[PDB]
Design a protein around this ligand. Structure first.
Ligand code: NA
Length: 181
């Protein structure tokens, strides 16, 4: 439909921790916007099954965060592996954006990309090599005109789809508040 090589792929992952070599992906969500940030389509929101031995690597922050959000229960009940989650996500993305065209979009999205390289390289390969990191603009705004940041806030629930929606909202806010294009 609105298929375009200008569309942007937004992605957020939840993990059992901060180290791709030790930890695992437990949730993935994708959203496609057009080049003007209008949300065209939301992709699969997938809790990825992990065994207790992997959930047992979570520290207090991860355990409490992902238990309170309901994600841990969804992970335990999930019947979807990483490979199946890749398959579902690629089947969605192919309907909206051509392969290799969109940068990876989100907040501190380099961290998610590290997990993709390690655990989902077939999905990492779908992105252009560049990164659209909304937190780059956050950090520049904090230094150049920090009072701007008081006009926007986030809930930060660590539910992957809700967090990526907040990433898009943050960039929409910067478009009006700190850009002149
Ligand atoms: Na994130």
């Amino acid at each position: 439909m609105s298929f375009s090589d200008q569309n942007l792929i937004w992605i957020d992952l939840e993990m059992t921790g901060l180290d791709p070599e030790m930890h695992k992906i437990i949730e993935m969500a994708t959203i496609v916007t057009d080049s003007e940030l209008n949300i065209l389509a939301e992709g699969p929101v997938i809790a990825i099954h992990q065994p207790e031995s992997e959930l047992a690597k979570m520290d207090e922050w991860c355990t409490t965060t992902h238990t309170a959000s309901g994600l841990v229960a969804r992970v335990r009940q999930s019947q979807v592996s990483e490979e199946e989650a890749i398959d579902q996500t690629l089947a969605f993305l192919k309907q909206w954006v051509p392969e290799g065209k969109s940068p990876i979009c989100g907040n501190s999205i380099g961290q998610d990309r590290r997990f993709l390289y390690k655990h989902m390289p077939r999905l990492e390969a779908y992105f252009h090599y560049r990164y659209i990191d909304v937190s780059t603009i956050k950090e520049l705004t904090r230094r150049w005109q920090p009072e701007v940041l008081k006009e926007f806030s986030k809930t930060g629930s660590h539910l992957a789809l809700d967090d990526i929606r907040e990433s898009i909202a943050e960039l929409q806010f910067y478009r009006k508040a700190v850009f002149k294009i």
